[PDB]
């Protein structure tokens, strides 16, 4: 209820760049300053001969709204031989996903293609670049020798990423093994030390990765979204990922142990084609020090009063318990075709009750389908199922809908007033908006 | 005025806390002019199946002469969105996706309209005969997008408002869902409009597939009675979506495709033997309670309607309208029928 909607800070990028497709906070903490990280997957860059490569921008908060691209990569395409490009950075969608731990920044290009050594191909392997302060290192786990539609050739690694508490990267590639999907995790210290610009398939010793399964699991899209939290009580963050096309398109969410990538818990959707698993988030919402799972099903259709189905969307709120189980509560959308549950951003304790809150977005809801964000507060019982606040998109539709709330991030007190804030991205109008929690420091 | 659904227009009065009711009658007639469009999956997985379309011309017309006033046929095809990761975009494989296997495969396309609905069966036979196979990589194929385009493009396909519209979708694989398109970077929701320029679906590469709710809405808005003809084990996938898609049938193509005409005739018989209604209740503060008095005497909840209906036989829908609050008209239509009942509702508050 205490998010300042009167005077939110506004950030804008180049038109059509999808600026705001991914949002995050950058808090180096070796320097006291604060920044916003905004991904612009379709932005034009200065790379030689690259068109719509993408960008990740670092945006100031202190009395200005200027943004500067992060120079992850300035080179064009490397060449495998004379008149034989190794790779194709054009339309690579760099900055579609952005993550930042303390001083590190991980940003990825899911639609990056490359030509394998064996033959002249175009394999959508996807690539990531890890900035670790002074150093910048490329991380492309899914581009390797064993690549095809059969292998990791179509992996699109970096489609979704996250940072583990103990400094590992979690990376999901929905496309590997005929779109069975895959998760890959490796330690940052190993990523930055094993990097060699001249080796196109770098090997990582302590890398954890899920493997090939039966043919029945094809087109499951494991790695569509990822999240991390401790779920088996050993203090090491476990890997939560959505598998929206699993179980004959019912959708699924897997939890793999972070120590060895061993499967722990499975969730399954209850309506076909609802995309159970489009969005996934993990936080302790009821304040019992156990992480709780949030799963979005933006295409869920609900039986109305007349018996007519209405596509309102759904978010499953699953509270973890000490017994090693969960208690699930279904949170339905409020408008038809608004896609409630597209984004699920934990807020921390937005108002400092001692109970964390969570934000859920319906990017095509509200007046004129401008997009709407719902704020839900935490309680000892669970999540208060009545939105304590409504956030409405302000920008009108251009050629494509504004999509306010498509990407969002919170749980950072950017203004150092003691209360976590929230950033919301509207890539349809190339906007990012910061909402600052008012005091109830 | 209405031939099947009577009364076609109703005017009632209401006051807050009060109620009203009237009886709606839906009466199928003996013979319907039939428009049947053959939307085919021309991907590389349907190579053994496409050659069997030559048999769905003369024989199907002679079969359907007994159940239709007149019978029309049309042809159309789809494979998938022509972007990575769905197709291989290497310049050799981009336009001949079967290059490694050395087949004369046509370039892949989203949805091509081949032949408008016509009473000349020879045109359909020849258009079917000349048609060849295309290809792509992933198993799921863009059935729903081509389905929506066929349903919404009236003047292009040639749907008659007087006809019992049938849209047959023939495939062997699951279809792509709305949010599958994010892998290609396509993050623009489908608008549900028509975009056939030169009989080709041009916006297949720039906006995502429709969702089941959107497809159902646009199918029922256009009175399209969809028949799914599916060959493999993926038939049950479509059969399980029927509860989510009112007014849709699914039939199994036998492995040799020998039952493709009996499939159509059986599906049409099932279609014309079922009456079920829904209400477009956009009137604020007014709620409807419709119960279907089936001819056998059952009291079904209306939304599901009644089955085994014939001509010389009327289904009666008992409509009870309640006012709860206040701030127009509502439309009760039997899905798959070309007539609707418009309930104009006056009131004072």
């Amino acid at each position: 209820f205490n998010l300042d909607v009167d005077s939110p800070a506004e950030y804008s990028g180049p038109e059509g760049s999808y600026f705001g497709f991914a949002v995050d906070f950058f808090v180096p903490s070796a320097s006291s300053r604060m920044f916003l990280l905004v991904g612009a997957p379709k932005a034009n860059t200065t790379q030689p001969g690259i068109v719509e490569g993408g960008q990740v921008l670092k945006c100031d908060w202190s009395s200005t709204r200027r943004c500067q691209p992060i120079e992850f990569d300035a080179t064009g395409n490397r060449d495998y031989a004379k008149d034989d490009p190794l790779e194709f950075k054009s339309h690579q969608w760099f900055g579609a996903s952005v993550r930042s731990k303390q001083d590190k920044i991980l940003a990825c290009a899911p639609l990056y293609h490359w030509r394998t050594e064996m033959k002249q191909e175009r394999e959508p392997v996807g690539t990531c670049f890890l900035q670790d302060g002074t150093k910048t290192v490329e991380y492309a786990p899914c581009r390797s020798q064993d690549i095809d539609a059969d292998g990791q050739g179509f992996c699109q690694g970096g489609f979704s990423i996250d940072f583990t508490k103990a400094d590992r990267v979690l990376l999901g590639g929905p496309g590997s093994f005929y779109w069975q999907g895959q998760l890959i995790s490796d330690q940052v210290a190993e990523i930055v030390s094993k990097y060699d610009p001249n080796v196109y398939s770098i090997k990582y010793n302590n890398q954890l990765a899920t493997r090939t399964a039966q043919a029945i699991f094809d087109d499951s899209y494991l790695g569509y979204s990822v999240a991390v939290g401790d779920f088996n009580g050993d203090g090491i963050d476990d890997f939560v990922s959505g598998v929206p096309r699993a179980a004959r398109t019912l959708g699924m969410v897997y939890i793999y142990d972070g120590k060895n990538m061993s499967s722990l818990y499975n969730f399954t959707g209850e309506q076909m084609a609802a995309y159970f698993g489009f969005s996934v988030a993990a936080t302790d919402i009821n304040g019992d020090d156990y992480a709780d799972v949030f799963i979005g099903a933006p295409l869920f259709m609900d039986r109305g009063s007349d018996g007519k189905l209405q596509e309102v969307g759904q978010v499953s709120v699953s509270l973890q318990r000490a017994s090693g189980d969960f208690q699930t509560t279904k949170l339905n959308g409020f408008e038809v075709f608004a896609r409630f549950g597209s984004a699920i951003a934990p807020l921390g304790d937005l108002d400092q009750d001692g109970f964390n809150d969570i934000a859920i977005a319906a990017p095509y809801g509200g007046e004129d389908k401008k997009g709407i964000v719902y704020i839900f507060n935490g309680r000892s019982t669970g999540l208060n199922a009545v939105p304590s606040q409504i956030l409405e998109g302000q920008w009108a539709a251009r050629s494509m809908p504004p999509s306010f709330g498509y990407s969002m991030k919170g749980a950072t007190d950017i203004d150092k007033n003691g209360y976590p804030d929230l950033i919301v991205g509207a890539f349809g109008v190339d906007r990012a908006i910061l909402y600052r929690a008012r005091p109830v420091g | 005025i209405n031939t099947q659904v009577t009364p076609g227009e109703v005017s009632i009065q209401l006051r807050p806390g009060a109620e009203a009711n009237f009886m709606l009658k839906v009466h199928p007639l003996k013979k319907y002019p039939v428009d049947l469009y053959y939307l085919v999956d021309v991907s590389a997985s349907m190579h053994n199946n496409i050659e069997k379309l030559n048999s769905v011309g003369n024989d199907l017309s002679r079969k359907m002469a007994f159940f239709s006033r007149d019978f029309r046929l049309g042809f159309g095809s789809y494979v998938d969105k022509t972007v990575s990761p769905y197709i291989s975009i290497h310049p050799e494989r981009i336009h001949n996706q079967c290059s490694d296997y050395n087949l004369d495969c046509m370039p892949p396309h989203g949805y091509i309209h081949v032949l408008s609905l016509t009473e000349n069966i020879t045109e359909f036979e020849k258009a079917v005969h000349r048609q060849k196979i295309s290809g792509n990589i992933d198993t799921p194929e863009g059935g729903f997008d081509a389905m929506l385009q066929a349903a919404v493009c009236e003047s292009h396909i040639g749907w008659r408002k007087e006809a019992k519209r049938l849209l047959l979708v023939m495939t062997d694989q699951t279809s792509h869902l709305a949010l599958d398109s994010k892998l290609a970077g396509i993050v623009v929701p489908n608008d549900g409009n028509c975009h056939l320029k030169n009989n080709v679906y041009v916006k297949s590469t720039t906006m995502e597939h429709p969702s089941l709710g959107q497809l159902s809405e646009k199918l029922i808005d256009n009175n399209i009675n969809v028949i799914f003809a599916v060959q493999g084990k993926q038939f049950h996938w479509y059969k399980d979506l029927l509860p989510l898609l009112p007014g849709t049938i699914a039939g199994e193509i036998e492995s040799k495709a020998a039952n493709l005409n009996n499939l159509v005739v059986e599906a049409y018989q099932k279609l014309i033997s079922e009456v079920k209604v829904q209400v477009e209740n956009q009137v604020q503060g007014i709620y409807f309670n419709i119960t279907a008095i089936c001819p056998d005497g059952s009291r079904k909840p209306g939304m599901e309607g009644c089955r085994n209906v014939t001509s010389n036989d009327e289904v009666l829908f008992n409509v009870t309208v309640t006012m709860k609050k206040c701030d127009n008209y509502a439309i009760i239509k039997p899905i798959g029928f070309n007539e609707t009942a418009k309930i104009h509702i006056h009131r004072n508050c």
Partner: peptide
């Protein structure tokens, strides 16, 4: 088969 072209491959 796997993929649309798995039928051709097989």
């Amino acid at each position: 088969g796997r993929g649309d072209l798995g039928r051709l491959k097989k």
